[PDB]
Amino acid sequence: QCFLIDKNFVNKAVESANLTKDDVVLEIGLGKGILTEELAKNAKKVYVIEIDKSLEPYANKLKELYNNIEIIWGDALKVDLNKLDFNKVVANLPYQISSPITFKLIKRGFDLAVLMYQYEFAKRMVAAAGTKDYGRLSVAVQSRADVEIVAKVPPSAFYPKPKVYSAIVKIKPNKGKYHIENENFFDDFLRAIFQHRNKSVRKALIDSSKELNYNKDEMKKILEDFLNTNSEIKNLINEKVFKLSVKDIVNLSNEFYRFLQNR
Numbered sequence: 001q002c003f004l005i006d007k008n009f010v011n012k013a014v015e016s017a018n019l020t021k022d023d024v025v026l027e028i029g030l031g032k033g034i035l036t037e038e039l040a041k042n043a044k045k046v047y048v049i050e051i052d053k054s055l056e057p058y059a060n061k062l063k064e065l066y067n068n069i070e071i072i073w074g075d076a077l078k079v080d081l082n083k084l085d086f087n088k089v090v091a092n093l094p095y096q097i098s099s100p101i102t103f104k105l106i107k108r109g110f111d112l113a114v115l116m117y118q119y120e121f122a123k124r125m126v127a128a129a130g131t132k133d134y135g136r137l138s139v140a141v142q143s144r145a146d147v148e149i150v151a152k153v154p155p156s157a158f159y160p161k162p163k164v165y166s167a168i169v170k171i172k173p174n175k176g177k178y179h180i181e182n183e184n185f186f187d188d189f190l191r192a193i194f195q196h197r198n199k200s201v202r203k204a205l206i207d208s209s210k211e212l213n214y215n216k217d218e219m220k221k222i223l224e225d226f227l228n229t230n231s232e233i234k235n236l237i238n239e240k241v242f243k244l245s246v247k248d249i250v251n252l253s254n255e256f257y258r259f260l261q262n263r
């Protein structure tokens with residue numbers, strides 16, 4: 001585990017979290033508790049989910065100085081977040097859990113998250129439509145939240161040192177912006193189309209038709225009829241997957257869902 005030892009980056013993450021004494025913060029991972037302490041100082045209360053019980057000495061020492069820290073010993077991928085009341089998440093994430101934890105947190109919901117990722121992962125998260133790092137992860141995150149890189153973090157900020165850069169990413173959930181009709185279908189639709197990101201949406205959906213539980217002949221006919229509903233759909237499905245904006249992907253999947261339900 002690479003612990004964050006540079007207080008300048010701790011400060012940047014905390015400042016970006018815009019904390020007040022009315023905020024309740026969830027932290028994933030304790031480390032030496034350098035971030036934990038700053039959260040404790042500034043927030044109403046901090047929950048720390050930590051998998052490694054050997055780190056108890058840091059926890060015990062922290063509770064002697066701060067009365068508003070609660071440790072939950074366990075695996076953050078296993079813990080039922082629904083049973084916790086918090087409005088913000090601030091963490092130097094274990095990079096191996098980056099993807100599942102991000103969606104688990106977004107599913108649970110929060111006002112704002114400020115999270116450390118590997119830099120490449122963060123770049124994919126915030127990638128603009130039609131660019132080389134734009135992909136399924138970009139759309140899955142941006143369709144549900146506004147995301148931005150707050151700072152690039154060098155290996156020297158950590159001990160022991162990682163091999164690559166990290167990034168602080170700010171996440172502000174945004175349900176209204178795009179409005180996903182059906183979460184399950186949208187997830188299936190995203191999987192199908194980004195299995196073939198350089199192909200047209202049409203050709204991607206035919207190739208990955210089994211991801212939506214249709215055979216290739218059914219899907220081809222479906223899209224013939226779907227294309228006949230309006231000219232906007234025609235232009236969208238003929239375009240390359242990675243070139244569609246998040247807005248257009250959400251709208252397209254919404255319309256396709258409705259089309260399929262009526263069929």
Ligand SMILES: Nc1ncnc2c1ncn2[C@@H]1O[C@H](CSCC[C@H](N)C(=O)O)[C@@H](O)[C@H]1O
Pocket residue numbers: 001002003004005028029030031032033034035049050051052055074075076077091092093094097
């Ligand atoms: N699945 C998991 N659930 C909860 N904690 C985990 C975890 N996997 C790793 N951890 C813990 O998360 C921490 C990651 S290193 C980050 C430590 C600290 N936040 C800092 O900035 O220095 C370690 O304490 C490690 O034991």
